[PDB]
Amino acid sequence: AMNYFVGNSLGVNLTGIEKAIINRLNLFKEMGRPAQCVFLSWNRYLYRNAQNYITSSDYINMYDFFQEATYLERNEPFDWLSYWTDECHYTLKHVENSHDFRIYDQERFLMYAHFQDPKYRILDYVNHFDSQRRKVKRDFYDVRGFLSCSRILVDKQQTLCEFFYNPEGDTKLEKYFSYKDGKPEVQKIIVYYANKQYFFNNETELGAFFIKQLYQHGDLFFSDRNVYTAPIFNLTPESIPVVAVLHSTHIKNIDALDSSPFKNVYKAMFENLSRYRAIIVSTEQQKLDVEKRINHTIPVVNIPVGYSETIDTPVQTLDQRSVKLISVARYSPEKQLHQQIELIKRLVSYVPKIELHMYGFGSESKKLNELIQKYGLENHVYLRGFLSNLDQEYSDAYLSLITSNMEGFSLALLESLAHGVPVISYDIKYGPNELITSDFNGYLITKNDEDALFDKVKYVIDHPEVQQRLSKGSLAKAQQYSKASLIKQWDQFVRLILEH
Amino acid sequence: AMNYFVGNSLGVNLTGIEKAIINRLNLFKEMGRPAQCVFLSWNRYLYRNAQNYITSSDYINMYDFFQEATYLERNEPFDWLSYWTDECHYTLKHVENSHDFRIYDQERFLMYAHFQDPKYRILDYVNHFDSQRRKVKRDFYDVRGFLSCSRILVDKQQTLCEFFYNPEGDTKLEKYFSYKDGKPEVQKIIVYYANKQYFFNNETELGAFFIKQLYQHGDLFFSDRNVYTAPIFNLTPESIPVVAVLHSTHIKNIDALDSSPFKNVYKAMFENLSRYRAIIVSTEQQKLDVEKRINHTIPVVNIPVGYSETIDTPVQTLDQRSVKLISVARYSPEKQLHQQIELIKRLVSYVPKIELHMYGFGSESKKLNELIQKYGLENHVYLRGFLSNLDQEYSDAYLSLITSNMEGFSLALLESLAHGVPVISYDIKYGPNELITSDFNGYLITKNDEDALFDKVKYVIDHPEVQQRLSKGSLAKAQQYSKASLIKQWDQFVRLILEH
Amino acid sequence: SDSDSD
Amino acid sequence: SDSDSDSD
Ligand SMILES: O=c1ccn([C@@H]2O[C@H](COP(=O)(O)OP(=O)(O)O)[C@@H](O)[C@H]2O)c(=O)[nH]1
Ligand SMILES: O=c1ccn([C@@H]2O[C@H](COP(=O)(O)OP(=O)(O)O)[C@@H](O)[C@H]2O)c(=O)[nH]1
Ligand SMILES: CC(=O)N[C@@H]1[C@@H](O)[C@H](O)[C@@H](CO)O[C@H]1O
Ligand SMILES: CC(=O)N[C@@H]1[C@@H](O)[C@H](O)[C@@H](CO)O[C@H]1O
Ligand SMILES: *[C@@H]1O[C@H](CO)[C@@H](O)[C@H](O)[C@H]1NC(C)=O
Ligand SMILES: *[C@@H]1O[C@H](CO)[C@@H](O)[C@H](O)[C@H]1NC(C)=O
Ligand SMILES: *[C@@H]1O[C@H](CO)[C@@H](O)[C@H](O)[C@H]1NC(C)=O
């Protein structure tokens, strides 16, 4: 029996939801239960992105599946340049300040090639041109080497249809597109599978077909990317068991528990509750809020998405000269990172050896840079961008700040505690008040009360003895979220979930 | 050493030019010289169209060659209806008064299937539709059974691109198209051949490439459809010998031998004469006219496109009570068949048992039927359509009529004389003037003299002693065009045309 | 529909 | 320039 954690894809920078899935996979491995991530969306660099976290056998992508490229590794690089000049007798004209080449047969322009690396080892795409220099076709290569997709273009480079290949060059899917509000949308998909020809109207129906081909009796599905996965599970037979996992607040306005509409990302799930064996949320409070809202229609249970180990990297090696505050959060409006920049403006006149290091990425990074310049805080507030390993950054961290107005748990909060860094967080739904005991491992403060924020951060700077005591509380609280503790809950859950 | 006769294709109904090529292959076959027809254009019905005339080994089609279907035979016949209902679990709705099915699954319209035959053993094409009933793709089946071409559609069923398969379903050619003045034009061709990929701007460049793959030292090309074949031969090296064969009048106004421009269909040939070893035309007079006009730049030589054998069907078994006039001519304007319906309208006043049998096909079909219907001649004038064997129709024929304003030679005229049927023809260039001696085997009458046409036809009906005399004259004239005398002219030509 | 076939 | 259209 296999357990399948169904998300959408993996980017370059590991997000919360992707980390929750990989955490869950490492917990099932530790307990000996077979488990695989399932990715839906077409992504020809997915094998590169997954490389740094999971193995090739730890996941299945839907497009890889129909393209017979599941559990395939990289080929030894093909020397395209050398095959184009020596074998094809083409002429290559390098494009300056690029990894691109223009390809000609004598004086005739045929192809524009973009490589990914400056070593020309990874062909990315090739554009095909007709006698009038119309771009009729784009060839997209998988980072593993093979040609994954050809796109046929019409008019002003509009997508008309896509063809997906196995590594041998046989066609396995066809997609046909029409334009609606200036974007291409799928109107038909043809799949060649098990020597038959299947017809679908959209990617959701293809999703539902994929889930059905994966499923064997005794298998269990987990729906983690509900905006895509719920509609897919809605077109699968009830005989295939699936658990819905909520990753954040479930309603658009959390101060109206009874009345607020469900978020768009959960609508399709909440509108077909009886499809699901259960809902999992991260926190007690959200379990009780959700079980009320859905009038107990299906079981709701709380299993935190995050866990701690013991750390072999250094803990609380503080610089005795300066105070290092840290924010570990997306540069995104709900994290309200502008508030922590206001906090430093107020503190800098009192404690001038202060540093705030903000680890993350997103749209707000320009407004946040402009806010630091405005206040002349370039020496004190550092937008560090995204680091894939934070272990060294927690070593010398005095305090971690959270000014968010909505969490599902906050992996960053537990991660901080686990490295012995105490946290000062607004008391919001959900997670902070289950993870912080005021005056034990940090302080909870009323949502958006920036005065209480300043007062309490000032109190811990003034009292290095208090920071030492809260640090040790942080390691103790982290132990309540241990690997062993999460395995005990997942084991009981999996043993009770299937029908008997 | 192979002799290749290069035309465009063979229709469902043979053209004069297609017949000339088959005649030439039969003469080469009887004298023991290797010959093959070469056909350029994509025709998935070619194998069927060839079956009455030549062997599968007697021709190579260019699309067959790249599609790896050259010399491939008809498959074991496959039951599509049973595959779709029994194996696929689709529901078929037969379309009234057709060989067509609509195809549904899951309450959706998926496909429209058209068969060639009433026993539904030959799938012709299948149209595919998206979620909104847009026709996104057409599958075209070769009459031998395999899927030959998929066409992708944009907008108002416009042709965007075509994929061409070998019989296993591997892609061997891609064509990309753009519309110019409301018709689709090739802008790009991709061919996968000899483990390589080749790029062409148009069918001429692909033709040229095909000719160069066929050619072995010693082979000889005949260019028989010059509007396509000459532009192809203009892109092949002069070391490949080719002969130009003209099938009709060479200039637009035949009256201005010196000054009239060359017909559009022969321009590319006449603009590059030194490329060609010689010009072959059917008649003495066209030989004299063309040699003067090209200032003897290359040799010009007359070999008739038609020949006579001895006939093993009845000859001149006339019905005494009724007279049967025949026209063997395309339903196309330069044949001016309307004039013969007009002749009959006049003749029924004097011969109440007269019939005119018009054997052919073409565009004027409806306009000629409407003319017959408007004169109440439905019992005297029959459009018989195209018969592949006319042998039995000649048996009781009294006279043949030709009212054409231009002819290369006219095979129908020689066929008529060979079966003992005298001919009355306008004295036009070229062909009739050399095939008819007035008062010996028929009568030559002034171009468009409908008055004189009636007088001579009536005279021959009024005098059956004359019709018999001209019937013996006809069999005598046809003997001058014997299989044996054409072989002699062909054999001498092929022995001298190559440099030594 | 009339446009279904050719 | 018209030439920048060749790439994406
Ligand atoms: O520079 C960074 C910043 C963040 N993260 C990770 O990003 C995740 C953010 O998840 P969290 O639950 O805190 O919040 P979400 O992003 O879902 O709101 C955490 O696992 C962090 O460890 C990281 O690896 N490097
Ligand atoms: O029912 C028909 C009508 C015409 N033909 C043939 O089509 C050719 C007509 O070509 P011809 O040289 O007479 O002139 P064209 O039609 O090319 O001007 C001749 O071989 C005819 O015998 C035929 O086989 N069956
Ligand atoms: C709602 C929000 O801002 N962030 C949540 C985060 O609290 C949580 O750690 C994770 C649960 O897996 O899902 C994120 O997207
Ligand atoms: C000029 C014309 O209309 N038709 C000619 C016909 O007279 C000739 O007998 C034959 C030569 O093969 O080919 C056709 O194209
Ligand atoms: C498709 O053929 C059908 C069936 O004869 C006919 O009803 C329809 O008009 C055809 N479509 C065309 C030729 O446009
Ligand atoms: C850039 O492309 C344009 C085609 O639009 C062409 O005119 C010009 O020659 C090209 N220059 C190079 C460097 O190829
Ligand atoms: C394609 O990329 C090349 C090189 O980066 C650049 O010259 C060209 O402008 C790009 N085209 C775009 C992105 O419009």
mmCIF file of C-alpha atoms in Angstrom, chain A residues 241 277 496-500:
data_model
loop_
_atom_site.group_PDB
_atom_site.id
_atom_site.type_symbol
_atom_site.label_atom_id
_atom_site.label_comp_id
_atom_site.label_asym_id
_atom_site.label_seq_id
_atom_site.Cartn_x
_atom_site.Cartn_y
_atom_site.Cartn_z
ATOM 1 C CA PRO A 241 -9.747 7.383 -0.399
ATOM 2 C CA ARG A 277 -12.210 10.673 4.547
ATOM 3 C CA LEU A 496 -7.610 4.337 11.502
ATOM 4 C CA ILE A 497 -8.318 6.283 8.218
ATOM 5 C CA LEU A 498 -9.253 3.482 5.755
ATOM 6 C CA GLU A 499 -12.788 2.007 5.964
ATOM 7 C CA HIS A 500 -13.400 -1.454 7.552
#
